[PDB]
């Protein structure tokens, strides 16, 4: 996260860190708890990862340094990638992880509510992106979970910025005109969470951008409301 601040413990209880164990154990991507065996994340996180067996999902983590040899984690039973995601395209960037065991809910780990079918993103003026990603284009994964408040931009505005790419209605963009706050590398798959009527909703999944936090180059997010049906179907 570029231009972010440290989160506090329990602040983002739906945020998870997905680790690969191969060749060495480390943070791969963010994700969101959306039910007791279900993590929602970005499909593109699984480029050179196919086997669930290499994944470990950690919840209730503030600092990556909290994760020790003996720390509890969730195994992943299945990776569910949307059928229309292609490795040659940036869209349909959404996946489910089915966990091998059940997340136990506490104040520091619980699901985030999905937007309801037909909800409208223009409603949201309090949107936050979170993760352990880079603070600038070339950097390192950060130890403490970071947060930044960023404003949603209209699809029409976002297409104007990305003449080369097809920004569909299944994508949402966010960022300041002047840049400075954005998701960056390592933030992929994590939430864009917007607070409305005192409730946090999962509006976006961090997906892609042209660099990090550049002037007139908003980050792009999978627009979660357009996938509620997919989610419900795959999870039943």
């Amino acid at each position: 996260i570029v231009g972010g601040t440290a989160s506090v413990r329990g602040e983002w209880p739906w945020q998870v860190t997905l680790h690969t164990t191969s060749p060495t154990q480390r943070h791969l991507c963010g994700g969101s708890i959306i039910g007791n065996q279900w993590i929602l994340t970005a499909a593109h996180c699984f480029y050179g990862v196919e086997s669930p067996k290499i994944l470990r999902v950690y919840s209730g983590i503030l600092q990556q340094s909290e994760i020790k040899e003996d720390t509890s984690f969730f195994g992943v039973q299945e990776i569910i990638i949307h059928d229309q995601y292609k490795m040659a395209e940036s869209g349909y960037d959404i996946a489910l992880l089915k966990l091998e065991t059940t997340v136990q809910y506490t104040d520091s780990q619980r699901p985030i509510s999905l937007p309801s079918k037909g909800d409208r993103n223009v409603i949201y003026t309090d949107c936050w992106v979170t993760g352990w990603g880079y603070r600038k284009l070339r950097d390192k994964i950060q130890n403490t979970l970071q947060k930044a408040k960023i404003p949603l931009v209209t699809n029409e505005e976002c297409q104007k910025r990305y003449r080369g790419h097809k920004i569909t209605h299944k994508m949402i963009c966010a960022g300041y005109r002047e840049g400075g706050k954005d998701a960056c590398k390592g933030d992929a798959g994590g939430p864009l969470s917007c607070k409305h009527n005192e409730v946090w909703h999962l509006v976006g999944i961090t997906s892609w951008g042209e660099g990090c936090a550049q002037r007139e180059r908003p980050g792009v997010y999978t627009n979660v409301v357009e996938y509620v049906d997919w989610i419900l179907e795959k999870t039943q």
Partner: antibody, heavy 117, light 101 residues
Framework: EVQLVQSGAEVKKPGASVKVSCKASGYTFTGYYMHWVRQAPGQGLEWMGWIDPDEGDTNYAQKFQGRVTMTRDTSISTAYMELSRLRSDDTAVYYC??????????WGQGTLVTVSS | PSSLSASVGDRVTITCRASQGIRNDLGWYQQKPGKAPKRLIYAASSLQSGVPSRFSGSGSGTEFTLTISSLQPEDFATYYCLQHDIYASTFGPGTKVDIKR
């Protein structure tokens, strides 16, 4: 004008170490990371790692982890790459380079390191 | 390592693969024998200052492409992508564009 000037050619025995220097001028040294890239004779480019001359943090390719150390000395605008436990396929030209996105790139002239008995 | 024989005037397209996680952080470099590489494109599609406009780049998903619209004599060289991912940067293998006389 930006210039990166490296130290001269080295010959080393297998199992020894080598330390190559790269001195920068014409820009703010601490503003831009410095990357090390090597190329064995007739072969492709191989990225080795970077160093942040501001805070001093490094990042090394997997292949060199545990055998390379990059360092800097800010006041003489110089980066260093030290490779240990040399083997015959460490024989290569080594470059330092400023590769920051959104600006021109700059490269050192290269340093031949030959590893042999 | 790859070899491509082309004529002056041909259009050439070179393809690199990298995680979409790189956030377009992909450079294209040109190298002639005896010389250090020179960057042509950064950020997948931005043409570096001083580079001719016949060079262009594109990124979509995991697929990154350098296009030379119409090759000129001075363009015969070896081309490499450099992807900058979360834990490491990596050069692609090298495409040598030879003169098809």
């Amino acid at each position: 004008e930006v210039q990166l000037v490296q130290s001269g050619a080295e010959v080393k025995k297998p199992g020894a170490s080598v330390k190559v220097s790269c001195k920068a001028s014409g820009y703010t040294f601490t503003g831009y990371y410095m990357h090390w890239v090597r190329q064995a004779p007739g072969q492709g480019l191989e990225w080795m790692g970077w160093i942040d001359p501001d805070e001093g943090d490094t990042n090394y390719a997997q292949k060199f982890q545990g055998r390379v150390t990059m360092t800097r000395d800010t006041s003489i605008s110089t980066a260093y790459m030290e490779l240990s436990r040399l083997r015959s396929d460490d024989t290569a030209v080594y470059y330092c380079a400023r590769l920051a996105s959104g600006f021109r790139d700059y490269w050192g002239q290269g340093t031949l390191v030959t590893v042999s008995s | 390592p790859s070899s491509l024989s082309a004529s002056v005037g041909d259009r050439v397209t070179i393809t690199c693969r990298a995680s979409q996680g790189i956030r377009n952080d992909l450079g294209w470099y040109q190298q002639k024998p005896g010389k250090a590489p020179k960057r042509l494109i950064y950020a997948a599609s931005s043409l570096q200052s001083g580079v001719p406009s016949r060079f262009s780049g594109s990124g979509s998903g995991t697929e990154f492409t350098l296009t030379i619209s119409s090759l000129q004599p001075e363009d015969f060289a070896t081309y490499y992508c450099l992807q900058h991912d979360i834990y490491a940067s990596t050069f692609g293998p090298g495409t040598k564009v030879d003169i098809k006389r």
